[PDB]
């Protein structure tokens, strides 16, 4: 098994302040304003208002 | 004088605000960050930092 | 190679691919549904074992 | 023989309050003598809770949705309420779990159950003896039993107005089904009772299920074998939400105060500097 | 290939959808070869893994049902095209790597 073949793929990931091109299959919602909420903005999550 | 106690206490006040820009040996100084891309476990590590 | 506007879904090589090695460094691998990337590259090649 | 009842009353589904119930146990760090701040899966004090009563011409068995854990809480004069059943689809296809008392000994097992579509217990009220009963047609791949020792249950009917309160907490977490139990002597007639009780663990049971679903399991008193009756009985139900509760133990080990640290601004007072 | 994902914090068909163990986990995994125990010149196909799931299942849970699964809703009633048989055969060989 030492001397036998394996194919090898690097991902190289870049997170910038910049629009997302590669995504994860996570399902979207609607925008709810003016409460207290979790929220999930491109992979960015946080709480609040 | 009097100005300087306002002075005083305006500036300490601003550098306990900018403090939280600083990073101290985490990965990223936004919690959302660290919190959005790490599993728990390591979440914890760098969060207790 | 760049990989741009697409859904990461992994879920698709589970019946097809075995990858005796997975490792990710940056993220979390529990974390990689919930995420969305700037960009993203593949490098590709072969090693024995 | 899944026998179906044809003169039932829809339920009323009345919603009452519970006033400071619902309190358990939330780990097993043995604390003597201090206050616990702790964030958990708790029920919140004065939330509404839903009744289910099965007095006259109605035998009240639906399918209610676990919802993150339970709290259960029976009135039970003639021990009519005896065990559950937890489950996802609440058929052969998914395990499910029957955690139920027959007259002799308590019994939990897990199986592909053909649940019934109204499992329950025949008791005869004139010879105060149990008729077998069938909760499940077939069961198979059962994954846990545990029996307990024998005992004995009194089937007979009682008058007046219910004496007693079982209450418990249902949890599921990490493959673990926890049961918390408690009992209260009450005298009332028709509501839930004002109190406070800690519900102390009795059992964590390593299922591993996903539970979305139960169904409690009653005992019915047919006058006549060509019909069929009830005594009266009620349970209430209400759904844990994660909340912060300051819990305050005794020298024992004994939870004997909680606060509600969300329920009004002493309360959150109260919590934020944590004293009583 | 799969052992690696029998550990906290793994993505993979056994950590999604056969075995999850929690993240704060106080315990020994122990793993050992049997080919000749469990394999044969002809082929071993006891040993199954579900291999799609709707949901990810959470720590210390098991998943016993046969249900013929559907991408989107779509009720089958046998096994053909969209209609797939949750579990799949290891298929183990003695001459396998
Ligand atoms: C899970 O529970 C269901 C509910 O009973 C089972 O379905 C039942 O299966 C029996 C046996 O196959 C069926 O009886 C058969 O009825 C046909 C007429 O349709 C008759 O030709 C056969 O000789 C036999 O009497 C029964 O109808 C059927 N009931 C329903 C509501 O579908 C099912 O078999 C159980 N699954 C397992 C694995 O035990
Ligand atoms: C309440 O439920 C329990 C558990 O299902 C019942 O216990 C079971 O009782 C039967 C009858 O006594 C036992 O059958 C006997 O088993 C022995 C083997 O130890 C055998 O030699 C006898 O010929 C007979 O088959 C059964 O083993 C026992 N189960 C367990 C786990 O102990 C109990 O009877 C029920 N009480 C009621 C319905 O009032
Ligand atoms: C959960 O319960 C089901 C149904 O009881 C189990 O499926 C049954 O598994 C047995 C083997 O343990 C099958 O019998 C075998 O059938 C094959 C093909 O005909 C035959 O070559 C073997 O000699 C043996 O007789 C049975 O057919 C099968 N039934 C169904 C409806 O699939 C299942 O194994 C249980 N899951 C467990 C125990 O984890
Ligand atoms: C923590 O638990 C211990 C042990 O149960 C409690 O100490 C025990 O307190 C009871 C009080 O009911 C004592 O039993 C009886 O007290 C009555 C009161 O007059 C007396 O008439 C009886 O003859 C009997 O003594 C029991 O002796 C005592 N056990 C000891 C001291 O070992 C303690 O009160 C509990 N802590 C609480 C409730 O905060
Ligand atoms: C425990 O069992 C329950 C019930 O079997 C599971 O809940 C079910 O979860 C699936 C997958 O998330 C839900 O399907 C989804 O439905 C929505 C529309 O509501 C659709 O847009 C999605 O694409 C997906 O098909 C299903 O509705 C839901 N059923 C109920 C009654 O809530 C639950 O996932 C199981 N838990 C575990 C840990 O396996
Ligand atoms: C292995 O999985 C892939 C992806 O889940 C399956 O490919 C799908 O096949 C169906 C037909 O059965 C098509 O409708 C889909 O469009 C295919 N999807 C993709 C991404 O190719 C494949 O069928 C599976 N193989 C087996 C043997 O079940
Ligand atoms: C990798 O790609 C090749 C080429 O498409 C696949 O080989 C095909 O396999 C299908 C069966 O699913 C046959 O119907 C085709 O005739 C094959 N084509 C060729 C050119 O060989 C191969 O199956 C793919 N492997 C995986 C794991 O997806
Ligand atoms: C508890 O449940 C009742 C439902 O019976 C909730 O709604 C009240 O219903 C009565 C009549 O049924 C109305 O007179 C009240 O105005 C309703 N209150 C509302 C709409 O806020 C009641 O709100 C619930 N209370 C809690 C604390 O959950
Ligand atoms: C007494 O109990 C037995 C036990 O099955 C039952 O058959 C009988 O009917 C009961 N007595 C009366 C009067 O019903």
Known sequence: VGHQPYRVVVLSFELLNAPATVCGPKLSTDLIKNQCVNFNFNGLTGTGV | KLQDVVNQNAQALNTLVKQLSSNFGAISSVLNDI?????????EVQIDR | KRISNCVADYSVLYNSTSFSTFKCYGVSATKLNDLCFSNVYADSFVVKG | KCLDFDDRTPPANTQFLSSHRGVYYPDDIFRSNVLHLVQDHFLPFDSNVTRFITFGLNFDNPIIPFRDGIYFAATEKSNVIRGWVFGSTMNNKSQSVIIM?????????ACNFELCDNPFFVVLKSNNTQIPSYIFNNAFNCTFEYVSKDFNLDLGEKPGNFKDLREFVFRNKDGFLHVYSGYQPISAASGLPTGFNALKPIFKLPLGINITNFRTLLTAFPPRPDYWGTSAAAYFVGYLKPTTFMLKYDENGTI???????????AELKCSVKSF | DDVRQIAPGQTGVIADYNYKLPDDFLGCVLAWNTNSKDSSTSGNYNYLYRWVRRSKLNPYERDLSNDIYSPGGQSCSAVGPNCYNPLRPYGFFTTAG
């Open chain 2, 35 to 43: 919190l959005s891309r790490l599993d728990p476990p390591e979440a």
């Open chain 4, 101 to 109: 008392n027959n007259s002799t000994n308590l019994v939990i097992r």
């Open chain 4, 256 to 266: 004997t105060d909680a606060v509600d640290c969300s329920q009004n601004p002493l």
